[PDB]
Structure 1
């Protein structure tokens, strides 16, 4: 119970003879790697990611996406003017964590990003901006400040900026899980979008965004949410109500002065997509969350307010639009200077689906 790989006796250390050396040479030849030279690495005491905790500043992400907007045309080959946050610990891979791409995308005036689909699951989130529609399976979906937009695996999507002003948002994808696991399919669709109309709300939303109500034409459950946009007005209202209910002495908040919602698939009550969990948190000025260790990785974008994240004991101060990653099992807490709003995503549905999830909370 108390020993680690540092502290235990290495009892499988063979005599370094010419025959041993011949046996090891013969291993390499035959595509064999013995367990005993390697045990501690393959099976650590607790998760020890190669991904490192890290913070990206929004002013930095903005300046670089804007410069990218001058110098690089968006179109067919590369598909998107999207800049992926790359974990310094992940050997040059465009992965914010071992499971997830997190990135900034920029669409300049009147630009179109052509239609494609991929098994990989995706979502858009907007800290600031208006002007872009993303057309998901032919259904135009407005993008605005505070909106979560979904694009589940295997759905066609392309984006067009219907205005003379640029917008930026963030993408989250299971791109990295999907590459390492070999699950990727990809298909090119129309070079434009298939509908340039700009309805204020999409068809999915007009069918599925009535609370506690389900169309009779939609009685089959789905693996991904059929809600295309989760609009800021509902998220804001939910969070306010939880805070109001707290004031009124009623249970609601997840911890004192900590309001939070999880975005869900209305057909099951579960996660928006099989691999990706989205949440939105609002902390009262002064709130400090209890330190957590969680299996798998999570990313936050600050939506509004000022505060700090503490990861491994290290406080970093945070401003609007800043992003950070918390690798598997790294202890973390948030601290609200003002009322602190944040957008969150994680690979938790993968961890929970496979029974790998664990949670340590300080104070219990």
Structure 2
């Protein structure tokens, strides 16, 4: 940068290039930033748009000519043309047509399916068939064989969230093909063993790295958030903040996050609730499941409508405001920040 630009210097630099050495002193860029400054940028996708483009994708791309991958990837404008919503996460709308199937495969990358629209599709996870409907969270944890069948003439839309960008950058990717029955049970084996509150099968005493619950069904989510707002009505502690009910989807063998790499939550805000501004390390994505409100990011307010999705990159100040009762599904890379002692939180309140 500032050494004397002499012949002997330029010879040194020439030698550098040759030996693949880069010297610190010529480096100008933001080495060790004061706080995180992501290349990802806050962004909002409108459901009215995504749904439109999804339905058209249904007409224009059949099985045999791309229909197998009929998946609308959400790309952050800041991430150089990659189909990545944040630096750690991949989120896409999977638009599954009438009677459509996918064979089984397995990969190291962890993944979930959040059903936004439809019913009567089964994702068959290690042979265990897990039914899908609006508001269910399905897990297909890393190295679990998974495939699916649509048992109906209606299509389905779901959010596919994966840890692809993390796994790509970090070199951890593995993949295998599997290989019929097409069973359609109302509840999977996993749910039948693990979905009884406070009870654990004697046959499942070993803890697991990922939840053995195949589906976190809408019924239960909805009940939990209602009780929290009800307890608040009654003077009882329940909500994380006034008007703000919320649960964390957990692995019951452990009480921890669903998968090693991804946290999932569900938030219910009472009409007129306005959350305190947060800065949190790493990235998160919300989908507005029901109701109307707005989000503030970097001081910019965006009005939000049913089905809209948005991303908050690392350290971006954010808050939500409910106009009506505001329901949002949430996911993030937080289990990574926390496993590695990188997590840090600033709340405007405290």
Shift of residue 188 of structure 1?
A: 1.2
Tell me the CA shift for residue 147 of structure 1.
Answer: 0.4
Asked if structure 2 preserves the Cα contact closer than 8 Å seen for 1:132 and 1:142, the reply is: yes
Q: Deviations over 1:150-208 (max 9, x none)?
A: 00000011111110111111110001100011100111123xxx431111111000000
Offset, 1:124: 0.4
Aligned partner of 2:42 in structure 1 is 53
Following superposition, the deviation at residue 32 of structure 1 comes to: 1.0
Which ranges in structure 2 are unaligned for 5 or more consecutive residues?
none
Q: In 2 relative to 1, CA 51–63 (structure 1 residues): closer, same or farther, beyond 3 Å?
A: same
Which residue of 1 is the match for residue 32 of structure 2?
Answer: 43
Question: Per-residue deviation at 1:69?
Answer: 1.6
Pair 1:195–1:42, CA change in 2 (3 A): farther
Q: Which runs of 5+ in 1 are unaligned?
A: 1-11
Q: CA deviation at 1:332?
A: 0.3
* Offset from partner CA, 1:114-156 (integer Å, 9 cap, x none): 2111000000001221121111111111110110000000001
CA contact 1:76–1:114 (8 Å) conserved in 2: no
Please say if residues 118 and 154 of structure 2, whose CA atoms lie closer than 8 Å, have aligned partners that are also in contact.
Answer: no
Post-superposition CA distance 1:270-307 (Å, at most 9, x none): 00000000000000100110000000000011100001
The alpha-carbon deviation at position 79 of structure 1 amounts to: 5.0
C-alpha contact (below 8 Å) 2:61/2:67 kept by paired residues: no
Separation of aligned partners in 2, 1:77 and 1:119 = 24
SS in 2 for 1:79: helix
Which of 159, 168, 181 does residue 157 from structure 2 map onto? 168
Paired position in structure 2 for 1:116:
105
1:75 deviation in Å? 6.7
* TM superposition shift of 1:39: 6.2
Matches of 1:300 and 1:214, distance apart in 2: 31
CA positional deviation for 1:334: 0.4
SS at match of 1:155: coil
- Residue 2 of structure 2 is aligned with which of 4, 10, 13? 13
* TM-score normalised by L of structure 2: 0.97
**Contact persistence 1:124–1:172 (CA under 8 A):** yes
**Is the contact between residue 74 and residue 113 of structure 1 (CA under 8 Å) also seen in structure 2?**
no
| DSSP-derived class of the 1:19 partner | helix
Matched, 1:183 2:172: yes
CA distance in 2, matches of 1:342, 1:201: 25
Offset of residue 77 of structure 1: 8.3
Distance 1:129 1:78, change over 3 A: closer
| Match of residue 292, structure 1, among 278, 293, 315 | 278
Deviates more, 1:57-66 or 1:222-231: 57-66
Shift of 1:326: 0.4
Tell me, yes or no, if the aligned pair for 1:140 and 1:195 is still in contact at 8 Å.
no
For 1:25 and 1:305, the matched residues in 2 are separated by: 62
Contact kept, 8 Å, 1:47 with 1:329, in 2: the verdict is yes
Residues 76, 64 of structure 1: CA spacing in aligned structure 2 closer, same or farther, 3 A cutoff? closer
Instruction: Provide the TM-score with structure 1 as the length reference.
Output: 0.93
8 A contact 2:211–2:259 mirrored in 1: yes
Q: Note if contact 1:122-1:152 (Cα within 8 Å) is conserved in structure 2.
A: yes
Equivalent residues of 2:285, 2:312 under 8 A apart: yes
